[PDB]
């Protein structure tokens, strides 16, 4: 499913992401925009052979099992395909674990390079929340 900007913002808010670990809603919406363009079905293969899945492009090396990433860890205890569902609950629950990992949102390279330090509030501007 390809989410609309305000639609996603509202879904994330409902799932408790607004200010989770100190990160305002605009940060999560900005990260989703640049990581997957709001597409739940987005996947991208990495050079090390692992693959990124879903709206938040969660990596198979540590977070989910895809059955093809040798020696990976599956910290979120889910098959990576669950991360591509139109229901974002799995992606959200796993993102919460990742952001709590100590590195915060820097875990997402697109957030670090394109969202960090920018007017992220602009991403929820105009939305009925």
């Amino acid at each position: 499913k390809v989410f609309g900007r305000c639609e996603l913002a509202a879904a994330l808010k409902r799932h408790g992401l607004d200010n989770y670990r100190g990160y305002s809603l605009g940060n999560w919406v900005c990260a989703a925009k640049f990581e997957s363009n709001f597409n739940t079905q987005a996947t991208n293969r990495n050079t090390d052979g692992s693959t990124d899945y879903g709206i938040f492009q969660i990596n198979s090396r540590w977070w989910c099992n895809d059955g093809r990433t040798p020696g990976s860890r599956n910290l979120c205890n889910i098959p990576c395909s669950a991360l591509l569902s139109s229901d974002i609950t799995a992606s959200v629950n796993c993102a919460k674990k990742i952001v709590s990992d100590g590195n915060g949102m820097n875990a997402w390279v697109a957030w670090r390079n394109r969202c960090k330090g920018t007017d992220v509030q602009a991403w929820i501007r105009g939305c009925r929340l």
Side-chain angles (χ1 to χ4, degrees):
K1 174 189 178 183
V2 178
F3 277 90
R5 185 179 57 91
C6 297
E7 184 183 18
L8 182 66
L12 294 183
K13 189 181 179 185
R14 171 168 71 101
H15 283 84
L17 279 191
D18 185 22
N19 279 102
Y20 180 89
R21 242 57 180 214
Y23 294 93
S24 68
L25 204 60
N27 283 283
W28 299 102
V29 175
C30 183
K33 173 66 183 186
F34 297 121
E35 285 290 349
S36 67
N37 197 37
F38 302 141
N39 184 4
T40 67
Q41 298 192 79
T43 55
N44 283 290
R45 198 84 186 257
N46 300 302
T47 44
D48 63 2
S50 62
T51 300
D52 301 326
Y53 296 83
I55 199 80
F56 290 128
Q57 287 294 270
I58 293 176
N59 192 260
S60 66
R61 176 166 305 304
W62 321 91
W63 312 103
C64 60
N65 177 66
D66 64 0
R68 72 166 195 189
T69 308
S72 57
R73 288 297 299 134
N74 199 6
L75 301 178
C76 293
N77 281 293
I78 46 166
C80 298
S81 51
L83 301 177
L84 306 177
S85 180
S86 53
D87 185 314
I88 68 170
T89 306
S91 281
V92 174
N93 290 163
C94 191
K96 282 179 172 172
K97 311 198 67 179
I98 298 174
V99 77
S100 298
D101 206 60
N103 204 38
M105 283 196 75
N106 291 295
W108 286 278
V109 71
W111 177 79
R112 200 170 70 245
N113 293 325
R114 318 181 64 180
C115 301
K116 189 176 187 170
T118 71
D119 176 33
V120 300
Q121 305 84 76
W123 288 104
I124 62 166
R125 188 165 301 154
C127 308
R128 175 113 163 66
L129 289 161

